[PDB]
Amino acid sequence: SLIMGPCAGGSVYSPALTDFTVMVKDISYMFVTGPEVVSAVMGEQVTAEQLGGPAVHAEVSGNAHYVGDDEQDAISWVQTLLGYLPPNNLDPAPVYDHDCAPGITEADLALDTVIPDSEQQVYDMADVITAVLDDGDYLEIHPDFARNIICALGRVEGHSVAVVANQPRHLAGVLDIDASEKAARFIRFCDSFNIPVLTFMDVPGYLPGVGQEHQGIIRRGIKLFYAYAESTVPKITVITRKAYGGGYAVMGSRQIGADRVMAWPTAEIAVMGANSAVPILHNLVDDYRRRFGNPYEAAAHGYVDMVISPSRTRYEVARALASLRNKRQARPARKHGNIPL
Amino acid sequence: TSTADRIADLAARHEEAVVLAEKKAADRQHLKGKLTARARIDLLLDPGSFVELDEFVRHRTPRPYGDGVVTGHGTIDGRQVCVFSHDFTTLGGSMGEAFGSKVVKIYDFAMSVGCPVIGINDSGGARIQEGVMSIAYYTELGVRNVHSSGVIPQISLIMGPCAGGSVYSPALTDFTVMVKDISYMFVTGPEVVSAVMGEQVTAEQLGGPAVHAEVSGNAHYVGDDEQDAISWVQTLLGYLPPNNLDPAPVYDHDCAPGITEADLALDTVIPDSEQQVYDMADVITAVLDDGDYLEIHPDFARNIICALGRVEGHSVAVVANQPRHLAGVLDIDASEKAARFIRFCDSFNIPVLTFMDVPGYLPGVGQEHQGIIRRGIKLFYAYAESTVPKITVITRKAYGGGYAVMGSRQIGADRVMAWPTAEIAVMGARFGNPYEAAAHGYVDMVISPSRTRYEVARALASLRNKRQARPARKHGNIPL
Amino acid sequence: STADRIADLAARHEEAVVLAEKKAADRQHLKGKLTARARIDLLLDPGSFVELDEFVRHRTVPRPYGDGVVTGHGTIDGRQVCVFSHDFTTLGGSMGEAFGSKVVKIYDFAMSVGCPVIGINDSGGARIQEGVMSIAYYTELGVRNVHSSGVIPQISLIMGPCAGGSVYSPALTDFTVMVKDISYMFVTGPEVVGEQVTAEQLGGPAVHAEVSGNAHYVGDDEQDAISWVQTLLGYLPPNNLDPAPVYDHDCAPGITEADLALDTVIPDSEQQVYDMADVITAVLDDGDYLEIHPDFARNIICALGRVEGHSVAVVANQPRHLAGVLDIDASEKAARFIRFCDSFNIPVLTFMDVPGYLPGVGQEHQGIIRRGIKLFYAYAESTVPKITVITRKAYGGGYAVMGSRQIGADRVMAWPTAEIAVMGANSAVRRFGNPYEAAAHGYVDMVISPSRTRYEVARALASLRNKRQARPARKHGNIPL
Ligand SMILES: CCCCCC(=O)SCCNC(=O)CCNC(=O)[C@H](O)C(C)(C)COP(=O)(O)OP(=O)(O)OC[C@H]1O[C@@H](n2cnc3c(N)ncnc32)[C@H](O)[C@@H]1OP(=O)(O)O
C-alpha cells in the first residue's frame, strides 16, 4: 500500500491488511476516526498530522513501514522492495550477479575489532550487517520504528536474505513490545515468501517494567517466539555478544529451529547476569559466574555449532546459506495456528 | 537378591516419591495458601484415571524423584487429557534438564494421540544453575506449543508466582487461567525490576491476577480459589473437541419447539430511546441452551462479550457487542479479545454466532497512536479467514466499519438476520432501519426478535455440513 | 579484552584440530591406520569441509573436544555431502551422548537438505561408562538410518574394528565398504565366541565380502576404499527426488566392431560358457562399470554403469560361475540392489542367461523359497524403467524372475540364441531352443541380432525417461524376510 493523500475511515482497512504500508511526507495521514470527531467526543483539538501524520505511524503506532521524503522517494522504495521479493509464494525470488570475493577482506577483518573491550561500551550492529551483505547494502523495514531492532532485506551471493538483528545503539538492543511485533511480522512475511532469515543476536532479554507488563509484553513479546518456531525457511544465527534468557531463546537459537548457529568469542550465553547471584545465594561468587561470559558451555552441549573468529562471519554465513537452498521442513496439519494477538 | 526384595524396594521408592515428598510439599504450600502439584492433578482429573509417567526421573549429578514436576495422562469427564503440574517446593518450580524432558514427553504424547494438554504452573521459570540447558528445554516446550497451536487445545492454570519461561509458554497456549491472591505473572519479578531498573513495585501491581484480567489481557479468567479455576477449566474442555479433526461433544437438550415467554421477552428488550441501553447478555441467554454460557475474558474489554454455549446440544461460539460498557463500540482491547477467540474457534471447528450492536470505534489520540488500525484489523482478518459456519443477528446499531467487521455477509457470514431496530448505514449523522440492507440482499432476513432462537437454531443445523476452501499457503501474514 | 578472547579461541582451536591430530596420528600409527580427519580430507573436495560441533564435550566430571567423532559437511565432486568420522584414539571411538548428538545433528541436517551421509567407522563399540545412555544414542542413530532409507543415499566405511552396537548403523545403510587388514565387523567378538577363533576369521573383510554378504566392497587400502565411495556417489542422485548426474558421452551412431563382437560371443556348444561381462561392457559407455558385491555370489553381476551419459543399473546372470544359476546368495544380492536402485529412480537393465536354481538340501532347508522370492518381489515392486536382454538360457522360474515382461519389464528383447521354455532336455522324460514361441505370444517384444543390443537398449532407455507408475497405497509391503 502507498498512502499518498488522506486515508481515513473505511479507506484504512485494506492498507492495514497488506504487508507493507508506505506513506509520503506532508501529503498523507491515516486514522480511523478524524480530528473533527476527536473534538466533539473528547474535547481535544488535534490537527490531522498530530493525530495520524506519517511520523506518528512510522515512529509511534508502527502502521507505516516507510515514509518517503517525496512521492518519487516512496515509489522508488517500493520498486526496490519488489526487487527482493518473489512474485508469489511458489515461484523463486530473483537471483542477481554478485562481486563477492573468496578471500578475507579488509571489511571482513574489521569485525575482529568491532566489539568493544568494555561491557559498558556498545557498537552499531549496522557495522556488522553491512560487512556480511553484498555491496554492504540493505533495504531497511521500519527504520524509524523500534530502532533497538533492525529488520532488513539484502542479498548474499545474489540471493535475497532477510536480516533480523538486535541493535545495541538504541535502547540497549532490548526486546520490548514494539521490537517484538516489528520483527515478528517481518519474519512471518519472509517465511511466507520463502526468504531465509539471518539473525544477529545481542540481547539482554525482554524489557521488564510496569509499562511493558501492563500492555502485555507476555502475549505481545512472545509473538516473536511463535514467528521463529513456526518458520520453516533456512535460519542462520550469528551471536555477537550478549545472549541471555528469553532473548537468546527467541533470537534464532538452535532449539527454536535455526539451521546453523555460529558464535563469536564475545558471545555470552546464560540465563541471566549480575541478577543470578541473588536469586541464588540469598562478588567472588560473581566472577565465578563467568563460566557463562563465553560461548563455550553452549558449544559444549552442541547448542551452537561453531565458534568462529568474527572476521570469518561473511564467508561462513555464505556457505551456510548455500548449503540450505534445498531445505524442506514439514508443517503441522491445521487450518491455521492461533498465534497470540 | 530375592525377587520379593526388589518388589519391596520398588514399594519403598514409590513411597519415597509420591507419599513423603507430598507431605513435604503440603507442609510448605499450605503455609502460603496453596495446594500441591499432585493435589491439583487430583482435583482436575477424574478419580482413579491418572497414569503418572516419569515418576522416577532424576537429575544426574539432593536429586529428588521427578526433578520438580509431576506429569501424566488421565481423563476429564471421560475424555482423555494430558497434564503436568509444577512442584514449586523443589527449587522454586524451576525447569532443569530432567524436569523439561518430562514436560516434553507428555507434550509429544498429546500431539501423538490428539488430546488436550493442561499445564499447571507454579514456577520461577528456567533454572539458572543449569545455564543454557534450561533455556534450551523451555525453548523446546515452546516449540511444541507453536506446533500444537490450532491442533490440540492447550490450557494453562497459573497457580503461583510465575516468571520467565513459566509465563512465556502459557502465553502460547490457548487459555491462561489465574487464581486470586496466590498467583502472579511477569517476565521478571519486582525484586529484579528494582535492582536492575530502579522501579519499586509490588508483585500485585506488576503482575497480579487483576492486572492481567483487566489491563493486559493475558488472563482469560481469574478463579476465586484454586477449585474455582480448575472447575472453569473442566467446563471449558466440555465445549471443546479433543483436537482439530475429531468432532466436539453433543449433548441432550430440552429446547422448546415453539415460542416461549423467554422468546417473547426479546420483543421488548430494545429500548424505545436510542439514548438508552440494554444488557446484551439478556439476548444471549435467551438464545443459548438453558440460558447458559462460559464467558472468556469476562473482565477484559467489557464492551464485547466472548462466550461458549450450546444450541440444541452443540457447541456454539458467541461474539457480541455489549452496550452496557462504552456503548458497545470497538476499541483495541475488544478487537484483540474477539479476534483471537474467533481464530481459536475456527481452528477447532466451532461455529460463531454474532450479536451486533456497534456504533463505531472508540475515538482518541490514545486509540490511534497505540495502533487501532494495525490492531483493530485483527478482528476483520479473523472473521474473513474463518471458514466455520457464521450466523449474525443484528439487534441495533450497525454503522460503517463496525457493521462490516461484526460478521456481516460481505466478510463471510453464512446467514445474516436483522431485527426491526437494526440501523444499517454508513453512519448516523429514515435510513435508521434495516430495509436498505435487506433490499440489496446484504442481510438475508428481517425477523421479529422473539423468533431469534428459532431461526438461529435452524441455521446452525443447516450449516453443519458446511465445507469451505482455504488459500494454498504456508500461513497468512495477519497483522501483529 | 576482545583480542584476548579471539586468541583464546585460536588456542582452543589448535588444541582441538592440530594437537589432537598429532596425538591421534601417533596412536593410529601403532595399527597402520589413518586418522579421522585424514580420511575426511581424502574423501571431500579440498577446502570444502565445514566442521560442526568442534568444541562439544561430554558433561561428566579427560574431556577432549569433539568427544571422539569429527562431523560436518562438504562436497564430493562438487555435490553436497555430510560425513562423520570416528576417532578410535579417544575412548576407543565408543559412542557417548555428546558423540551421539554430533552424529544425530549431522544426520538430521542431511535429511533436511537431501544429501548423502557417509559415515567413517572405527569404533570400539559403546561407552560402558555412560550406561544405558550409550545404547539410547545408538538406537536414535539407527532410527534415523531407517527413516532415511530410500530417501537419501547412505554409505558406511568400515576402517577399523566395528563390534556390537557399532555394526547396526552400517547394516542399515545402503552400502558397506571395508578395508583389507585393518577392519572387522562382528556382533559378538572373538573372545566371547569361549571358542578358539581370531577376529579376522570371525569377521574379517574376506568373510563379509565372500560369505556373509555384509560388505559390498573391500578396498586394498584406505585410499582405494574411499576412492570407490567417491565413484559410487558419482552414479547416484543426491536424494529420492532430484535427478542423478548426466555426463557427456562419445557413443557411436552406427555399428562398431565392439557391437559386432556380440554376434560371436555366444558359443556354438550349449555346454560352453562365456563371460557375461563381455556383453555388459559392450553396451555401457566406455566399457566401464562399478560392480557391487563383486566377490559375493559371483553367479550374478550387479553393477552401476552409464548409457548415453545416464546412470543405469545392470543385473546379469554370470555363466562363468555355477553356470549362472540362481541361489540364496545371488537372490539376496540382486534383490537389495534392485530395491535400492528403484528407491533412487535408476533404470534397471537385465541380461538374462539363467538355467534355473542351484539344487540341494541346503538350498531348501536354508530357505530358498522365502529368500529366493525376494528377487521376484524386488523386480515386481519396482516402477523404474526395466529393459531386459535375453542372451541365452531362459528356463522356468529363473526366466520369470530375471526381468521378464510379466514381472514388470517395459521392454524385452531376445537374442536368437535365447531358449525360452519351461524346461530343457528334461521334459521328454529345436522345439524350445529359440525365442520364437515367446515372441509369437508377445512375451518378448523384439528378436534382435546381438550386434543391435547397444543401439536398441539406448533407444528404449530414452523412450522411458518420462515413465510414471502409480504405486499401491499402503504403509509398506510385507516382503519375505
Ligand atoms: C516458551 C517460551 C520460551 C522460553 C524461553 C526461556 O525459558 S528463557 C527464561 C528466562 N528466565 C527465567 O525463566 C527465570 C525467571 N525467574 C526469575 O528471575 C526468578 O526466579 C524470580 C523472578 C521468580 C525470583 O524468584 P525468587 O528469587 O524470588 O525465589 P522464591 O522466593 O520465589 O523461591 C525460590 C526458591 O527457589 C530458588 N529459585 C527461584 N527461581 C529460581 C530459578 N529460576 N532458578 C533456580 N533457582 C530458583 C530460589 O533460589 C529459592 O530457593 P533457595 O532460597 O532455597 O535457594
Author numbering:
A (entry chain F): 175 to 456, 474 to 532
B (entry chain B): 15 to 75, 81 to 448, 482 to 532
C (entry chain E): 16 to 76, 81 to 212, 217 to 452, 481 to 532
What do the authors say?
X-ray crystal structures of SamR0483 alone and in complex with hexanoyl-CoA reveal the molecular basis for medium chain acyl-CoA recognition by this unusual YCC β-subunit, prompting us to rename it medium chain acyl-CoA carboxylase beta subunit (MccB). Each monomer can be divided into two domains harbouring two copies of the crotonase fold that pack together in an antiparallel manner to form a dimer. Taken together, these results establish the existence of a unique YCC-dependent pathway for unusual polyketide extender unit biosynthesis.
These co-crystal structures were obtained via incubation of MccB with 5 or 10 mM hexanoyl-CoA before crystallization. The hexanoyl-CoA bound structures reveal that some of the substrate-binding features of MccB are similar to those employed by other YCC β-subunits. The residues that interact with hexanoyl-CoA are localized in three regions at the MccB dimer interface. In addition, the sulfur atom of the thioester is hydrogen bonded to the backbone N-H of Gly420. The third region is the binding pocket for the aliphatic portion of the substrate, which is formed primarily by the hydrophobic side chains of Ile396, Phe399 and Ala423 in Monomer F, and Leu191, Tyr157 and Tyr187 in monomer B.
